[PDB]
Amino acid sequence: AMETGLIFHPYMRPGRSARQTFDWGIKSAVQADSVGIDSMMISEHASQIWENIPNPELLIAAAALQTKNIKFAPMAHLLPHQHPAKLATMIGWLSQILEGRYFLGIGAGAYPQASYMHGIRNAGQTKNLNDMVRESLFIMEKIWKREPFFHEGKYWDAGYPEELEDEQHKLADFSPWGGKAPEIAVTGFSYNSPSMRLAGERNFKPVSIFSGLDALKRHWEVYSEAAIEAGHTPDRSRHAVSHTVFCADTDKEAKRLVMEGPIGYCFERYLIPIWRRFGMMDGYAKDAGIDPVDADLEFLVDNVFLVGSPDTVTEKINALFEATGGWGTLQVEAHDYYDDPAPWFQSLELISKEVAPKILLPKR
Amino acid sequence: AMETGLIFHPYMRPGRSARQTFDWGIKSAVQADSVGIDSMMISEHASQIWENIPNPELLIAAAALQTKNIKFAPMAHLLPHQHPAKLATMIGWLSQILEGRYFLGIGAGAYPQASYMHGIRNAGQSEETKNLNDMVRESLFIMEKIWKREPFFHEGKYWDAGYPEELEEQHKLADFSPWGGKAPEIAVTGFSYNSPSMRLAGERNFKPVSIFSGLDALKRHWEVYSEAAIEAGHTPDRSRHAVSHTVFCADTDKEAKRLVMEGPIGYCFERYLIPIWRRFGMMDGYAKDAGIDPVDADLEFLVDNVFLVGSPDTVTEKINALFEATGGWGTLQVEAHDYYDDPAPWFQSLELISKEVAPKILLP
Ligand SMILES: O=S(=O)(O)CCN1CCN(CCS(=O)(=O)O)CC1
Ligand SMILES: O=S(=O)(O)CCN1CCN(CCS(=O)(=O)O)CC1
Ligand SMILES: [Cl-]
Ligand SMILES: [Cl-]
Ligand SMILES: [Cl-]
Ligand SMILES: [Cl-]
């Protein structure tokens, strides 16, 4: 029932080249596809070192004809940063190339440095990024329908022309596969996530970043309530939840490999300090009954990360399902194993083939 | 030596899918690279049937790690259609992925239907309206500054954009400057006799790409270009000049001609290109050169008098003759046609052009 997914930020070690990063992305897509992973989400960042993909569509396109079954999604295209017509056209064309193995993450962008680059001062505090998202979506949906219009917006002018006065002289068809909008997704983190409400209101796919039991429950509560009120039927099998996940033959090996390898390195060098600064471990702290100040690597490995043998990880997931109601896709956060992929590819294969099929049905 | 290049519009037969088009592009890039073709230019169109690539960068990215030596160029990114920061970031990143096997065509866009989609009414005409050429100049201004990674903010007529100061190695800004930290080489195409693009190109030391329309225009392009270059203080270099031609080589003149007349090339010309060329007076240069009335310029006339078609010796002679008449050029940019269903004769032609013809061409 539960699918396995990859989310590729990618947390490349500072100093990796663009070609190395791109090669690791393609290799990751091909391997994930080969072990039955259902989706690969690729994030977008123009200002960050570790999250060093500014154009997830380039990777998706390079992996498209090298894979069979896996579905790709930008997670997310930052709508305030591009002309909606240009973006809508690219999405539809890529969706066509993939024969529908595609869905669309949309976002405002959480990094003011990148907002600034794209002409939006004071994104942290004028232009409103959320209004820009709404206007872009309004324009893109119309372009995908291939119904003519011209729109003079607050943020952009855009349109879709009427045919001029042989099939070869009609307008190109860059509508997404099947001629309909792709499925749209949005991520959420905070406890009362406005993204989850938007998602529910518009029947988008919710993607939650695991921050603790209370938030995971609250996300679904907010989502479904918004869905119901908007007249949609909430479907928990749509819900994707992003986790650190690592599987090996034993609990001991699993833990050692995380502690001493790429995952532990990224967390100690980069993620733990950010998470500390921004209070992103308060949910985990609450769940385990500790002070956030004492949330270190080994705490996360023992209490938060889905780490261990296939049986252990299966248990941990099933325990979360009983506590929170569950989810449709386990979205595994990718790490920089480009130097020595074997233990990481073995983990993914275990998660996908041995863990995921044994998970309980999610709460309706 | 004169180099061989490919220019991929493409001219896909109406009815080809996006996946087929994309597959043909990758196959074409791989094959061109394998036979020593120096560059592959890929054009950008959102409204056209035959020219059905709206995002050349997706193709370039998919071919990047599958090729060794060939250089790629969008020909051209239509600068009025996207946010210059987003575009500048993607160009730098792709340039990095390609390790500098990349140059940048820029353009305004010659299809009003597509201009309309991107919020530009009355692109065909010379509140107040939008000027595509001014939009090109503002985009380039912004992109060059972003590539330099020096902070600024610009509130333009068409866009707001900037480059931020560092916040008060992993926490510094990402570096998506192009390969070597400098702007890519910039190219523009020209067609008309007194091409304003050729003047711009000369003024700014861009690479000129001429679309072959006759002896007089080819000479006039270089005259305009070099005069502008010299006045701007640049040294005009003919080896930079790319000239776009229909080119087809086979073992004999008879085979070459039959394959063009009866195959994909002839089909595209009779069904699509000849009527357009007739309507817009694009055969007047060829007519003048051969001493005929444009009304009588049909397929076989183009094959016998204009297209570089024949045996390797014959095509070598035709090129050498053009070199004596006009002064020559640095790259023979072969216009690609839809041989996706029959690649053998077309790949054979490109191999002949690249290995047997081009090395025998006299100095420009
Ligand atoms: O670097 S800056 O200080 O400019 C912005 C840093 N900020 C930290 C918090 N994360 C939340 C990710 S999410 O899990 O809430 O989606 C967004 C980025
Ligand atoms: O389709 S529309 O009728 O709306 C515009 C027609 N127009 C005809 C001429 N071509 C040649 C490009 S070039 O050869 O001059 O570079 C550009 C498009
Ligand atoms: Cl992020
Ligand atoms: Cl529904
Ligand atoms: Cl064109
Ligand atoms: Cl010079």
Numbering used by the authors:
A (entry chain B): 2 to 126, 136 to 175, 180 to 378
B (entry chain A): 2 to 127, 134 to 175, 181 to 376
Give the exact sentences the study uses for this entry:
The oxidative degradation pathway of camphor requires two enantiocomplementary type II BMVOs, 2,5-diketocamphane 1,2-monooxygenase (2,5-DKMO; EC 1.14.13.162) and 3,6-diketocamphane 1,6-monooxygenase (3,6-DKMO; EC 1.14.13.–), which catalyse the NADH-dependent lactonization of diketocamphane stereoisomers (2,5- and 3,6-diketocamphane). The 3,6-DKMO monomer is made up from a single domain with an eight-stranded α/β-barrel (TIM-barrel) fold which has the nonprolyl cis-residue Ala77 forming a β-bulge in the middle of β-strand 3.
The native 3,6-DKMO crystallized in space group P212121, with unit-cell parameters a = 55.0, b = 93.4, c = 162.0 Å. The crystals that were grown in 50 mM PIPES pH 6.5, 50% ammonium sulfate contained two DKMO subunits in the asymmetric unit with a solvent content of 50%. The native 3,6-DKMO model also contains 798 water molecules, several glycerol molecules, four sulfate ions and two PIPES buffer molecules. The two subunits of the native structure were rebuilt independently. The root-mean-square deviation (r.m.s.d.) between Cα positions of the two subunits is 0.23 Å. In the course of the purification of the 3,6-DKMO enzyme the cofactor FMN is easily lost, especially if an ammonium sulfate precipitation step is used in the purification procedure, since the inorganic sulfate competes for the cofactor-binding site. The following residues were not modelled owing to disorder: A1, A128–133, A176–180, A377–378, B1, B127–135 and B176–179 in the native structure and A126–135, A176–179, A377–378, B125–135 and B176–179 in the FMN-complex structure.
